[PDB]
Each structure stands twice: as C-alpha cells, then as structure tokens.
Amino acid sequence: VPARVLNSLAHLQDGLNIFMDPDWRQIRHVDDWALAITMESAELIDSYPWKWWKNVKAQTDMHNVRIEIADILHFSLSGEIQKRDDVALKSLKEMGFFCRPPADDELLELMFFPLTEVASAVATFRNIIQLASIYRFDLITKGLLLAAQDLDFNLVGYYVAKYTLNQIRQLEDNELLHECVQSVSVEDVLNEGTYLKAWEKIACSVFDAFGMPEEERRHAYDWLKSAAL
Amino acid sequence: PARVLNSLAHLQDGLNIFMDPDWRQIRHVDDWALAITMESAELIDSYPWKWWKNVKAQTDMHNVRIEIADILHFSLSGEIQKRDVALKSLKEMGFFCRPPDELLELMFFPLTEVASAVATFRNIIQLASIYRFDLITKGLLLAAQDLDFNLVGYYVAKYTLNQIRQLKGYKEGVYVKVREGVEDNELLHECVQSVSVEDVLNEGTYLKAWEKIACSVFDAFGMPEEERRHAYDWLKSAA
Ligand SMILES: O=c1ccn([C@H]2C[C@H](O)[C@@H](COP(=O)(O)OP(=O)(O)O)O2)c(=O)[nH]1
Numbered sequence: 001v002p003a004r005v006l007n008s009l010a011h012l013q014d015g016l017n018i019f020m021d022p023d024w025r026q027i028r029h030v031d032d033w034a035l036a037i038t039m040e041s042a043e044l045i046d047s048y049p050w051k052w053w054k055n056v057k058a059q060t061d062m063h064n065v066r067i068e069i070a071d072i073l074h075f076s077l078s079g080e081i082q083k084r085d086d087v088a089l090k091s092l093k094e095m096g097f098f099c100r101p102p103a104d105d106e107l108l109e110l111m112f113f114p115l116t117e118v119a120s121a122v123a124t125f126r127n128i129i130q131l132a133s134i135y136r137f138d139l140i141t142k143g144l145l146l147a148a149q150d151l152d153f154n155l156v157g158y159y160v161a162k163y164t165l166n167q168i169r170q171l172e173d174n175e176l177l178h179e180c181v182q183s184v185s186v187e188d189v190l191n192e193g194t195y196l197k198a199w200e201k202i203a204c205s206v207f208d209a210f211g212m213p214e215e216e217r218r219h220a221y222d223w224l225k226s227a228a229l
Numbered sequence: 230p231a232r233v234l235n236s237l238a239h240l241q242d243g244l245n246i247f248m249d250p251d252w253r254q255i256r257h258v259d260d261w262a263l264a265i266t267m268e269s270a271e272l273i274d275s276y277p278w279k280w281w282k283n284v285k286a287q288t289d290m291h292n293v294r295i296e297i298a299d300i301l302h303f304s305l306s307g308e309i310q311k312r313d314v315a316l317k318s319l320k321e322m323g324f325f326c327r328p329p330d331e332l333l334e335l336m337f338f339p340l341t342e343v344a345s346a347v348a349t350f351r352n353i354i355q356l357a358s359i360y361r362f363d364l365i366t367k368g369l370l371l372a373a374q375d376l377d378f379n380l381v382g383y384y385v386a387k388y389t390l391n392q393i394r395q396l397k398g399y400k401e402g403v404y405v406k407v408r409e410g411v412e413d414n415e416l417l418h419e420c421v422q423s424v425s426v427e428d429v430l431n432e433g434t435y436l437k438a439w440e441k442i443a444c445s446v447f448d449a450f451g452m453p454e455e456e457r458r459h460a461y462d463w464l465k466s467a468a
Pocket of ligand 1: 053244245248298299300302303387391414
C-alpha cells in the first residue's frame with residue numbers, strides 16, 4: 001500500500017472532518033482519537049464470542065467486523081493527521097507488553113491471522129488499542145488495511161464509496177455501496193498511478209447509483225482531485 | 230480493610246470455579262486483561278465522551294457503580310491467576326494519560342465529570358495491559374470513595390447475580406435479562422442498600438452482612454435453597 005495512497009486517504013478524512021467542524025485540527029486532540037480507536041476496537045472485539053461464560057455458542061458477525069474496521073479507519077487517519085519518542089515502540093515490545101494468541105516491518109509481528117478466529121482477533125485488536133495508547137496512528141492505519149486484506153474486504157474501495165455518499169448527503173445503503181466498489185478492483189484502488197482514476201470511478205458509481213443528477217456535480221469531484229497532492 | 234480483602238479474593242475464586250472448576254488452568258492472565266478492557270469501555274460509554282454528539286443527557290452514575298464492581302471481579306481474578314521501574318518508565322514514556330501514589334498519579338477525580346472518568350479508566354485499561362491487577366483493585370476502592378458508594382456491598386450482590394445467571398442459561402444464550410424496562414443489575418441496588426457499609430467491612434459481622442446481600446439477590450430471582458448452596462458455602466469457608 002503506497003504511501004502516496006495513504007496520504008490521499010487522510011486528505012479525504014480531513015474533508016470529512018472539516019464539514020462536521022472546520023476547526024477540528026485546533027479544537028481536537030490526539031488523545032481523543034486514541035480514545036475513539038480504543039472504543040471502536042472494543043466494539044469490534046464484542047462482535048466475536050470471547051466471553052467464556054456467556055452465550056459461548058454464538059456465531060461471529062464478520063459483516064459488522066468489516067464495517068468496524070472502517071469505522072476505526074476514520075479515527076486513525078484523523079489522529080495520523082493530527083499528530084503533525086520513536087524508540088518507545090520497540091521498548092514496549094521488550095517489556096513484553098503487547099500481546100499474542102496463547103497458541104510496517106515493525107507492525108507485522110503484532111497482527112495475527114486468520115482474523116476469522118477469535119484468539120487471533122483479540123490479540124490483534126488489543127494491539128491496536130495499545131498502538132493507540134502511545135499515539136501510533138500510522139501503524140493502526142497500516143494494520144487496519146492488513147486486517148481487511150486477510151478478510152478479503154476491499155477496505156479503501158469501501159472508504160471511497162462511503163466518502164462519496166457523505167458528499168451526496170450534504171447536497172441498505174451499504175448494499176449499494178458495496179455494489180459500486182465492485183465496478184472497480186482491489187489491486188486498482190491501491191496501485192500507485194491508476195488509483196485516483198479508480199477512486200473517481202467508484203465516486204461516480206455512487207453518484208449514479210444514488211441519483212445525483214449529472215447536473216449537480218459540477219464540483220463534487222474537486223477535493224478528490226486535490227487528494228493527489 | 231484486610232481480611233475482608235482476602236475474603237473477597239476467595240469468593241472470586243469460587244465464582245470462577247462455578248464457571249469452570251479448572252479455571253486457573255484453562256484461563257490465562259490475558260483473558261483477565263481483555264475482560265477489564267471491555268468492562269472499562271462499557272463504563273466509559275456510560276459517559277458523554279463523544280465530542281461529536283448529545284452531551285446533554287445525565288450520566289447514569291448508579292450504572293457506574295455496577296460496572297466498577299464488575300472490573301473488581303476481573304482484577305481479583307487477575308491477581309489470583311498471576312501466581313515498578315517498569316511502571317515509572319511507562320509513566321515517563323507517555324503510556325498513561327491525563328485530562329487537559331504510583332497509583333494516585335493515574336486516578337483523576339471527581340469520577341462524576343466525563344473527562345476525569347475517561348482518563349481514569351483509560352488508565353485502568355493501560356494498567357490491565359501490563360497486568361498490574363494489584364493497582365487496579367486498589368484504584369477501584371479509591372474510586373468507590375470518591376463516588377461515595379459501597380463497593381464491597383455491590384461486589385457481593387453482583388457476585389451472587391453472576392451465579393444466578395449461570396444457573397439460568399447464561400452460558401447457553403437463554404437468560405431473561407431485561408424485564409419490562411429493567412435490566413438485571415438494576416435489581417442489585419435496593420439489595421445492597423438494605424445493609425450498611427460499616428456492616429460489610431466489620432471484621433466480625435461482615436460475613437453475616439454479605440450472607441445478607443447474597444440472600445436478597447436470590448430472593449429477587451426467587452431461587453430454591455439448593456441452588457444457593459454454592460454461594461452460602463463459599464461465604465462460610467471465607468473465614
Ligand atoms: O470468569 C468470570 C467471568 C465473568 N465474571 C463476572 C464478572 C462481572 O461481574 C460479570 C461480567 O459479565 P457480563 O456478561 O459482562 O455482564 P454485564 O452485562 O452485566 O456487564 O461477570 C466472573 O466473575 N468470572
């Protein structure tokens with residue numbers, strides 16, 4: 001996943017954040033993001049049957065898991081931006097604090113697959129809670145993208161689709177969104193070079209799909225275009 | 230107090246044995262770290278922490294009590310299973326947090342405002358992460374005296390509800406939890422408030438007053454005498 005792409009993603013988030021409160025980056029604090037990443041991580045974990053003593057038989061909600069990975073991605077990028085000392089990660093590692101199932105370089109040994117299995121997920125997403133602990137949003141974004149790759153979940157497709165809907169809502173939905181992501185590939189939306197062509201294809205599939213008359217779009221694609229930096 | 234605190238950890242042992250007898254063997258220190266992480270998030274969600282939402286509704290403080298009793302259950306558990314400069318270097322790091330002794334440097338009061346609650350239990354999670362259940366327990370008691378509530382009492386009440394639940398299909402997904410509006414735990418208030426704080430902490434009395442609470446909760450759930458035997462027997466042995 002090319003850095004260029006990672007940067008672009010954050011731009012869009014900044015757009016999203018701006019609409020809700022245009023002074024987010026002054027008012028808002030690095031510690032809020034870390035909080036929100038901690039809660040939605042918990043939220044994700046609660047979709048799995050981790051409680052040894054409660055409905056032990058419960059089937060996992062891998063759908064909700066996917067939509068939670070994205071919910072977290074929003075807060076992560078928001079903290080990434082906002083964060084604009086290092087040997088503090090490896091320090092926690094030797095302290096053996098980060099954890100593992102009882103059975104980028106630097107962040108792979110904290111992720112545990114397949115995410116479809118409970119212990120592997122619990123491990124993984126507690127380790128996001130910890131990366132957050134110490135404000136490492138950048139690795140939580142890279143981690144979230146891994147989670148999704150393991151889950152065969154086209155996360156940045158879905159993030160752009162969902163971004164473009166928010167655009168409409170200023171000027172079952174989920175089912176339509178996932179359908180727009182299809183018109184465009186996984187390899188495509190990440191491939192440095194073609195990616196901004198491909199994100200524009202998704203955007204445009206959303207607008208059509210929802211019914212943004214061609215005529216009200218004169219500026220819809222603007223920030224998206226500016227997201228190339 | 231002191232034998233009371235021992236007496237608490239013994240009950241915790243019996244509750245966990247009720248769930249799986251070979252628990253110390255099948256459980257793992259990280260199971261308890263997780264457990265505390267989640268009941269800490271469920272406590273924090275109580276509070277209007279979403280800057281992007283309605284802050285106006287009142288924080289349900291009575292609910293907080295019960296989620297504090299629940300964390301306590303988990304740290305007693307943690308402490309039991311687990312058989313300095315680590316911590317102060319983490320403090321240096323920036324690994325703990327603040328709103329905008331080694332223990333009362335990560336608790337922030339009053340627990341009544343969103344912000345101080347958020348730092349406090351964010352740091353309770355951070356603690357559970359390095360498996361310092363010892364400091365969690367103690368912060369929980371510290372927290373009970375800021376909220377001016379009867380932790381030991383609530384612990385015993387929830388302890389006994391935790392049993393009722395298992396006997397009523399909880400592990401199997403078939404328990405009646407909410408009944409016309411009202412959830413499980415809400416029942417636990419009038420129960421513990423039936424006895425005094427003084428009473429639950431006296432080094433002679435106390436086990437009598439805990440047996441009182443136990444019994445109140447069982448009466449709420451209308452239970453036969455035979456199903457109260459695991460709890461009444463662990464409350465005896467607790468001496
Ligand atoms: O091995 C265990 C597992 C759970 N609990 C107790 C602790 C706490 O009091 C409660 C948490 O259970 P819950 O299902 O999360 O209930 P609630 O929704 O009321 O918070 O269960 C134990 O004591 N021992």
